[PDB]
Write a protein that binds this DNA or RNA. Structure first.
Ligand SMILES: Nc1ncnc2c1ncn2[C@@H]1O[C@H](COP(=O)(O)OP(=O)(O)OP(O)(O)=S)[C@@H](O)[C@H]1O
Ligand SMILES: Nc1ncnc2c1ncn2[C@@H]1O[C@H](COP(=O)(O)OP(=O)(O)O)[C@@H](O)[C@H]1O
Ligand SMILES: [Mg+2]
Ligand SMILES: [Mg+2]
Ligand SMILES: [Zn+2]
Lengths: 657, 619
DNA sequence: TTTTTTTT
């Protein structure tokens, strides 16, 4: 009959230690108490969420032990039974809660406005969470220290979904995985307040279950004093509320055992942390892993078997300031950052440095422009690679996809045109047609890589025509007439008809693409493979070194690290330069010259398709991107001539023969 | 009760009889302890497989009681085992959770079940409440799931912890009053309780459906299947389509219509098998013994051992020695590098031969299939692009795994690949090259590992390879796919009376083969390693060899590749960087066969020899 | 059954 069990824990001692830590602990080694400082901000209502770092707890424990204490090993303790300790920390915060400083934010807070009133009428009465306005949280232990070592068996180590074991229930844990889907935020009440006129008393029902039943009667004294039976009424204003959202994390294919379907865990998020996540993005999350109780009837149906979920204390993203600023001036002072980055791209790959340069220009992307009249011209840049097989094209695209923070990789056959752009699922639930974000949607504000683009269906090719020239995606499918912004960059890989280019065939014929499609690309690269004894030797030596030593042969070159390129690329993209009139004259003359060339150069041998205004816009985008790299406030004629050189090289690669 | 304690002490005596059990228990305890010690960042489960014959000999009475009345003998037996472990165990400084864990020790049995051995179809109600074992293939594996067994609760305002345990038919062999399954909300005194998760204990519950062996399945009968409640460590010990023999207590459940609520009462009680131990049945993973590893090492000492192993392969087939060697290297695979930046460096070989009808190329693929540790057999027409790579399945809409996804680290083979639909061929392109599969159909973006090795077969564009006509004419496949693919082996029939007689005698002797046991008219049912020993060698190599490039081998490879690419001479397929990668992987595989952590110039020389033998022709 | 994107 509920037999008592002795356990080596005293919640009173642990609470005292927690209070001593909060009031005492300061980030002096890093540098009033930092925790007391946070509580002071909370009193100022500056912050409504509190994060208690387990590493800070460990530091405090180390300090106490070095001093010599009957340490309660709180940092370890929180892991075993996290929720009760979170409640204890919240209570301690309230106990050590400092008074308001500066000006308090209760200018119109109904709680503060009426809570005191309620007290004056009265002159735990009400649930502590009702007054509490701070969302408690816990930062996961930093694995770098792993001072627990023997104790740190895998605590910080993120674990796949299947890696999770019922033993971990009630314990803080870390998981790495992609967010399959995210629900829309919804409100939830920590406390429900009913108001009845007969009493004039505002009872405070507190609910922690998934569902609750209304009181529908007054236990309030005033109704009891008169013997009256109260008709309680819900008061949303009085009742406390919190935001809630739900997210599902699924196992990574790498984590997934061969022949095993990925497992997904439902994630509950509340308070400030809500909306922090983003669907389809790799993330490492740490939080309390708890069972999910049932409804009474479904509970009886299920019995001892229980649903389980995760409540995320903290979120870490593998990818998305002054430190950044210094890091970038380092490379800026190094100079030649443009060519240095181009070489740094695909360190594995040998040669094709011009291709790498163009890829970098695409990565930064051209300036997106909107006109006062309302015109908007796509600033994104799209490049096509049309070359003989086995020239590392696919490798290059995969490298770029990894490089870009939001990049997504795709193949034409494996991806449906509808799925590539967007899919209408007839029956997610109740057989209600729903639009599904396609690969392009996933690539929004990112780069989408399409291989075998020639093998891609022509109809789906026309489908992507809209998105690539025009950012938005308009869908009028059955039951769904909607538009999606769908701003993203496109990189396509394909090979000449019959596999490899035929010199006898015209460049356009070997390309075998719609002229509308061709023009919509800002650039097409006709990289070709010809046997060159010396060049073959050089490439073979490079590849052999790469095999022998995983690092590519240095070749008197230094390659910047991926995080560094992404940081610098973001900074450069922030520029948005504006070009000048001399550049206008130069580019206008060049465009006129090119159009005249095409108007005379229809010959199949040298025919690459007629020049179009889209070509001029792409040239302008490339010049603006070059300025972004150079970080200049205005585009320079140097950038224009460089872009012209890039295009001329792309076309002349064949002419060189 | 008194019988229960008597059985407990009897099993204690049994354990005392065979220290091997106690020795294994101590090994488990010490192993877990040392694992917990210095955890830089698995724990053996508390379970023992007691030999049934040991019990039968030590005390036939207790053994029979276990087999017939497990519900009355197994419980006290495991109780005694747990007590012996704990008393013998140090259990030093147990964690607060460890204190409340009460993690007990489970029991298990091995072989010698006699009549208790059964099959899903051969099972019978009579066997109910008796320990039994059956064999079959797993299907409809239900997902893992937690299950409350204890509800450790802290009595706030009183500084105390009041736990409650929970009972379920699956959890306990014996029938017990069902637990209300309600978290203790308030102390019996009246002090509100708090659900102290983590401290409260849970178990992993799984449900699977093992069906009778289709081979055993009688004609015109749907194979009967029975369910097994896998628990704890037993959970996740198998998956669908796993031929396995399991041991459990065949048990009955429910009201079977006996309940008053039942109106018709024309139903029967539910029955289940609370599996205590599971024995997977591959008939896979080859096994090695120190003596075998020493034999392998000495065998590597042999110089041309590569040739010997190659000949050992396809001994029935004749004439394709070079193709046999290529298959050998493929099986050895090579080293797949993966740069820290993220780049993936294929280290796998692919083999394909264009051959005349009846060339045995299909038979050769059949041999490679059976000998292979994990292989995938399919054919051009019989395969599908989605069926080969993956198909989005309505299931939430899931993604069906195609052949390539299957055996991702294993091997794959295709017959009549030329007859494969070109759309599915371009589907293959990405799988093979990138060694991965990505699908974004039906609004389901996905990426999958696809590094499985592939060995296709095909007939020339004209049935008979016309040497006069170009290989491109003779090959319907795009050169891109060909260059994508690794090693082209054009095999052509020839009327060489000497050779014709050679193969005639080969096949005649083959058909003359005699099973040593059998004789003439008795229907069934130079050195060459044994095929099981051959596979053992291959696995040992792949497990414990990683050849490293040598600058000399690098020089040889570079020279060969650059010349061949710059060699104007007509080639079976165009020379490309993929040719250089193929050279690297071939040298890696040859060095692997040499069981050397460092490549040798000889390895690369042999690789180049075979590559010229194929790409340019006989060399 | 009928209507219905979507994939096969
Ligand atoms: N310049 C190079 N540097 C490094 N590796 C190279 C180079 N050229 C070719 N390779 C390698 O040779 C192979 C080329 O084929 P893949 O990269 O698989 O695909 P690809 O055919 O080059 O591009 P596609 O036509 O879009 S599939 C890869 O293994 C590359 O690593
Ligand atoms: N060189 C050979 N050595 C041994 N058997 C051979 C040889 N050539 C053909 N055969 C026999 O011919 C039969 C049919 O071969 P098959 O696999 O159909 O060839 P293909 O795949 O070219 O049609 C096989 O069973 C094989 O035993
Ligand atoms: Mg490629
Ligand atoms: Mg055949
Ligand atoms: Zn009232």
């Amino acid at each position: 009959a509920l037999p008592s069990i002795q356990l080596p824990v005293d919640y009173n001692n642990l609470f005292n230690e927690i209070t001593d830590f909060l009031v005492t602990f300061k980030q002096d080694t890093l540098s009033g108490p930092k925790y007391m400082a946070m509580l002071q901000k909370v009193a100022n209502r500056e912050l409504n969420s509190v994060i208690i770092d387990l590493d800070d707890i460990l530091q405090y424990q180390n300090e106490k032990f070095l001093q010599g204490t009957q340490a309660d090993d709180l940092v370890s303790a929180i892991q075993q039974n996290a929720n009760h300790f979170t409640e204890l920390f919240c209570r301690a915060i309230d106990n050590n809660m400092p008074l308001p400083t500066k000006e308090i934010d209760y200018k119109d807070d109904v709680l503060d406005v009426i809570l005191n009133q309620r007290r004056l009428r009265n002159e735990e009465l009400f649930p502590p969470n009702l007054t509490r306005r701070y969302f408690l949280y816990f930062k996961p232990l930093s694995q770098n220290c792993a001072r627990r070592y023997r104790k740190k068996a895998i605590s910080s180590k993120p674990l796949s979904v299947r890696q999770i074991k019922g033993d971990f229930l009630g314990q803080l844990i870390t998981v790495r995985g992609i967010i399959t889907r995210v629900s829309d935020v919804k409100p939830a009440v920590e406390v429900i307040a009913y108001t009845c006129d007969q009493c004039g008393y505002e009872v405070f029902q507190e609910v922690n279950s998934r569902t609750f039943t209304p009181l529908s009667e007054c236990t309030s004294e005033e109704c009891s004093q008169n013997q009256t039976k109260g008709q309680l009424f819900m008061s949303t204003r009085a009742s406390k509320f919190s935001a809630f959202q739900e997210c599902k994390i699924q196992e990574l294919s790498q984590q997934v055992p061969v022949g095993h379907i990925p497992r997904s865990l439902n994630i509950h998020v509340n308070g400030t942390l809500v909306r922090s996540l983003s669907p389809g993005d790799i993330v490492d999350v740490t939080g309390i892993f708890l069972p999910a109780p049932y409804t009474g009837f479904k509970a009886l149906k299920a019995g001892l078997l229980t649903e389980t979920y995760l409540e995320a204390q903290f979120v870490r993203q593998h990818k998305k300031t002054s430190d950044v600023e210094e890091r970038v001036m380092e490379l800026i002072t190094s100079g030649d950052v443009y060519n240095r980055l181009a070489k740094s791209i695909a360190p594995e790959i040998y040669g094709n440095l011009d291709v790498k340069k163009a890829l970098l220009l695409l990565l930064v992307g051209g300036v997106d422009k909107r006109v006062g009249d309302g015109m908007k011209i796509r600033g994104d840049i799209n490049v096509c690679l049309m070359g003989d097989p086995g020239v590392a094209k696919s490798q290059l695209l995969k490298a770029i996809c990894k490089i870009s923070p939001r990049g997504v990789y795709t193949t034409g056959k494996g991806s449906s045109g509808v799925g590539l752009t967007a899919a209408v699922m007839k029956d997610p639930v109740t057989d209600e047609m729903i639009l599904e974000g396609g690969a392009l949607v996933l690539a929004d504000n990112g780069i989408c890589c399409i291989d075998e683009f020639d093998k891609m269906d022509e109809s789906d090719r026309t489908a992507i025509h809209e998105v690539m020239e025009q950012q938005t995606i308009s869908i009028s499918k059955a039951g769904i007439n909607t538009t999606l912004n769908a701003r993203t960059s496109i990189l396509a890989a394909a090979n000449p008809l019959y596999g490899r280019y035929n010199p006898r065939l015209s460049p356009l014929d070997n390309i075998n693409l719609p002229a509308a499609l061709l023009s919509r690309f800002d650039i097409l690269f006709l990289m070709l493979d010809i046997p060159s004894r010396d060049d073959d030797e050089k490439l073979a030596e490079h590849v052999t070194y790469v095999h022998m030593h995983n690092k590519q042969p240095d070749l008197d070159f230094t390659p910047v690290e991926p995080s560094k390129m992404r940081e610098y690329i973001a900074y450069a993209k922030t520029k948005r330069p504006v070009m000048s009139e001399a550049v206008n004259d130069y580019v206008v003359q060049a465009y006129i010259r090119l159009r005249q060339d095409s108007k005379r150069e229809m010959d199949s041998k040298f025919s690459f398709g007629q020049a179009t205004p889209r070509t001029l816009l792409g040239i302008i985008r490339l010049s603006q991107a070059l300025a972004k790299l150079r970080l200049a406030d205005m585009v320079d004629i140097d950038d224009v001539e460089e872009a012209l050189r890039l295009v001329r090289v792309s076309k002349e690669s064949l002419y060189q023969e | 009760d008194a019988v229960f304690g008597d059985r407990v002490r009897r099993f204690q005596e049994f354990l005392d009889t065979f220290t091997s059990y106690r020795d294994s228990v101590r090994s488990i305890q010490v192993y877990n302890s040392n694992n917990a010690a210095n955890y830089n960042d698995n724990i053996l489960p508390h379970r023992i497989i007691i030999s049934l014959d040991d019990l039968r000999e030590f005390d036939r009475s207790f053994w029979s009681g276990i087999l017939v009345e497990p519900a009355y003998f197994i419980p006290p037996a495991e109780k005694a085992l747990t007590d012996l472990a704990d008393s013998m165990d140090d259990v030093p400084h147990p964690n607060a959770s460890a204190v409340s864990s009460r993690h007990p020790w489970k029991l298990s049995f091995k072989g010698s079940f006699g009549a208790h051995a059964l099959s899903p179809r051969t099972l019978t109600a009579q066997h109910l409440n008796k320990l039994v074992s059956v064999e079959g293939i797993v299907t409809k594996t239900s997902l893992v799931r937690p299950k409350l067994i204890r509800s450790v609760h802290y009595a706030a305002k009183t500084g105390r912890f009041h736990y409650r345990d929970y009972t379920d038919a699956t959890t306990t062999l014996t029938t017990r009053i069902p637990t209300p399954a309600i978290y203790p909300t308030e102390d019996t005194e009246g002090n509100k309780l708090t659900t102290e998760y983590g401290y409260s204990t849970f178990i992993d519950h799984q449900r699977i459906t093992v069906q009778e062996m289709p081979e055993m399945a009688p004609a015109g009968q749907l194979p009967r299947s029975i369910d097994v409640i896998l628990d704890d460590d037993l959970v996740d010990k198998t998956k669908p389509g796993d031929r396995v023999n399991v041991v459990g207590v065949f048990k009955s459940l429910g009201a079977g219509g006996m309940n008053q609520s039942n109106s018709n009462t024309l139903i029967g009680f539910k029955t289940l098998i609370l599996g205590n131990t599971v024995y997977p049945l591959h008939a896979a993973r080859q096994m090695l013994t120190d003596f075998d590893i020493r034999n392998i090492n000495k065998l590597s000492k042999k110089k041309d051992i590569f040739d010997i192993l190659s000949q050992s392969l396809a001994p029935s087939i004749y004439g394709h020695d070079h193709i046999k060697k290529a298959i050998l290297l493929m099986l050895m695979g090579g080293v797949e590098k993966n740069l820290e930046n993220g780049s993936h460096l294929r280290g796998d070989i692919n083999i394909l031969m264009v051959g005349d009808p009846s060339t045995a190329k299909s038979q050769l693929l059949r041999f490679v299939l059976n000998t292979a540790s994990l292989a995938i057999a399919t054919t051009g027409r019989g395969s599908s692009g989605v069926g080969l790579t993956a198909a989005v399945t309505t299931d939430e809409r899931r993604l069906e795994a195609g052949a390539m996804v299957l055996a991702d680290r294993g091997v794959v083979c295709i017959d009549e690949f030329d007859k494969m639909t070109d759309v599915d061929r371009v589907a293959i392109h990405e799988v093979m090259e990138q060694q991965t599969v990505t699908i974004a159909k039906a609004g389901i973006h996905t990426t999958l590992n696809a590094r499985c090795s592939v060995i296709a077969a095909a007939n020339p564009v004209f049935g008979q390879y016309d040497v006069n006509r170009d290989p491109h004419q003779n090959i319907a496949l795009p050169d891109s796919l060909l260059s994508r693919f690794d090693l082209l082996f054009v095999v052509t029939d020839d009327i060489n009376e000497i050779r014709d007689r050679s193969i005639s005698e080969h096949v005649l002797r083959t058909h003359r083969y005699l099973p040593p046991g059998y004789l003439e008219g008795e229907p069934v049912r130079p050195k060459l390693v044994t095929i099981p020993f051959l596979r053992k060698y291959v696995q040992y190599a792949k497990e414990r060899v990683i050849p490293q490039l040598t600058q000399e081998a690098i020089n040889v490879i570079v020279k060969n590749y650059t010349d061949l690419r710059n060699d104007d001479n007509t080639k079976k397929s165009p020379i490309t960087a993929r040719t250089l990668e193929t050279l690297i992987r071939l040298a890696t595989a040859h060095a692997k066969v040499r069981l050397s952590k460092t490549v040798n110039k000889v390895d690369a020389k042999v690789a180049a020899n075979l590559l010229r033998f194929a790409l340019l022709g006989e060399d």
